[PDB]
Amino acid sequence: TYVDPHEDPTQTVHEFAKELDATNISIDKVVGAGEFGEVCSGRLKLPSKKEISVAIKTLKVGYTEKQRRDFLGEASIMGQFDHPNIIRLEGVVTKSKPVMIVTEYMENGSLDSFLRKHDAQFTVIQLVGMLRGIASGMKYLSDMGYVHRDLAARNILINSNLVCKVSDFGKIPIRWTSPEAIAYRKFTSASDVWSYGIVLWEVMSYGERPYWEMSNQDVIKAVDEGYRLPPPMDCPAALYQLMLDCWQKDRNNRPKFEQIVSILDKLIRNPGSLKIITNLLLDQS
Ligand SMILES: Nc1ncnc2c1ncn2[C@@H]1O[C@H](COP(=O)(O)OP(=O)(O)NP(=O)(O)O)[C@@H](O)[C@H]1O
Numbered sequence: 001t002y003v004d005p006h007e008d009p010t011q012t013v014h015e016f017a018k019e020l021d022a023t024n025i026s027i028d029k030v031v032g033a034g035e036f037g038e039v040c041s042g043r044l045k046l047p048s049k050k051e052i053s054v055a056i057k058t059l060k061v062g063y064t065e066k067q068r069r070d071f072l073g074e075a076s077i078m079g080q081f082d083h084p085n086i087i088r089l090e091g092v093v094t095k096s097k098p099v100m101i102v103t104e105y106m107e108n109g110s111l112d113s114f115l116r117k118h119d120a121q122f123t124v125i126q127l128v129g130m131l132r133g134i135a136s137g138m139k140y141l142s143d144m145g146y147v148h149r150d151l152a153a154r155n156i157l158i159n160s161n162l163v164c165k166v167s168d169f170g171k172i173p174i175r176w177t178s179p180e181a182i183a184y185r186k187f188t189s190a191s192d193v194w195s196y197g198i199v200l201w202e203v204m205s206y207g208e209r210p211y212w213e214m215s216n217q218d219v220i221k222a223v224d225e226g227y228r229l230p231p232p233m234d235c236p237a238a239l240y241q242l243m244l245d246c247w248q249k250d251r252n253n254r255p256k257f258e259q260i261v262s263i264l265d266k267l268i269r270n271p272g273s274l275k276i277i278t279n280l281l282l283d284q285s
């Protein structure tokens with residue numbers, strides 16, 4: 001079971017995060033920018049003396065106490081999960097400044113941008129492998145009682161071996177959010193399943209934006225009317241059906257993450273199944 005960080009004296013992070021000795025951290029280069037400061041790549045020397053690659057996020061100089069709480073709050077969530085398809089927290093640095101969060105390094109970065117650089121260049125089995133990993137991570141998160149609420153290809157990271165891992169544990173990504181969650185903030189693991197369907201579409205579309213640049217009001221209305229994203233080019237029928245199933249109007253009719261993992265495992269085991277190949281499309285009822 002997950003425990004929601006919220007009134008601890010200062011750190012609920014140390015309950016779920018190792019304090020690292022900064023002598024064990026080396027910084028290589030800046031690789032991104034976040035809400036709270038820079039993201040860099042580097043190396044961590046473990047207590048066993050093994051050295052691994054890591055991503056390092058720093059809290060900007062002159063941070064507000066709210067910024068520090070939000071920053072470290074991500075770590076306090078992430079550190080509750082230990083799963084091959086959820087980004088691994090190596091630890092935090094809080095006893096010296098800048099404050100740091102250290103995570104496993106993912107060489108190929110965010111999944112959406114990675115796929116956009118490789119349009120039509122992976123096999124269907126490679127894409128299904130990516131999707132299976134994401135579903136497996138979500139199965140564990142849902143098992144722990146955690147609703148992600150931001151599941152999107154931009155919040156999945158991918159490593160040198162194409163292994164995909166759920167990231168971003170911080171209103172309202174409209175394009176990724178279930179109709180009931182938009183309508184009245186009904187967030188459940190079934191709303192994450194909806195989001196997963198959108199990620200499935202993103203992956204099979206090589207990082208096309210869901211609903212393109214449609215007005216948000218039109219995304220909301222169109223989906224409510226029963227319209228759905230169309231099958232990506234050369235999309236296996238099995239995978240488009242899985243998207244449609246994730247996008248059922250009635251949240252109780254959507255598959256559970258365990259079922260999604262099972263469906264994808266069957267496609268991996270019987271790759272011939274993927275050879276059957278399938279503007280918004282109306283599929284009311
Ligand atoms: N563990 C990691 N390994 C390698 N690169 C990473 C890692 N974490 C973050 N990055 C890189 O840093 C970028 C920004 O980090 P991210 O976790 O997306 O923070 P953010 O606050 O969501 N900012 P953005 O995604 O740019 O709006 C990502 O797109 C990656 O390229």
Ligand SMILES: [Mg+2]
Pocket residue numbers: 154155168
């Ligand atoms: Mg991000």
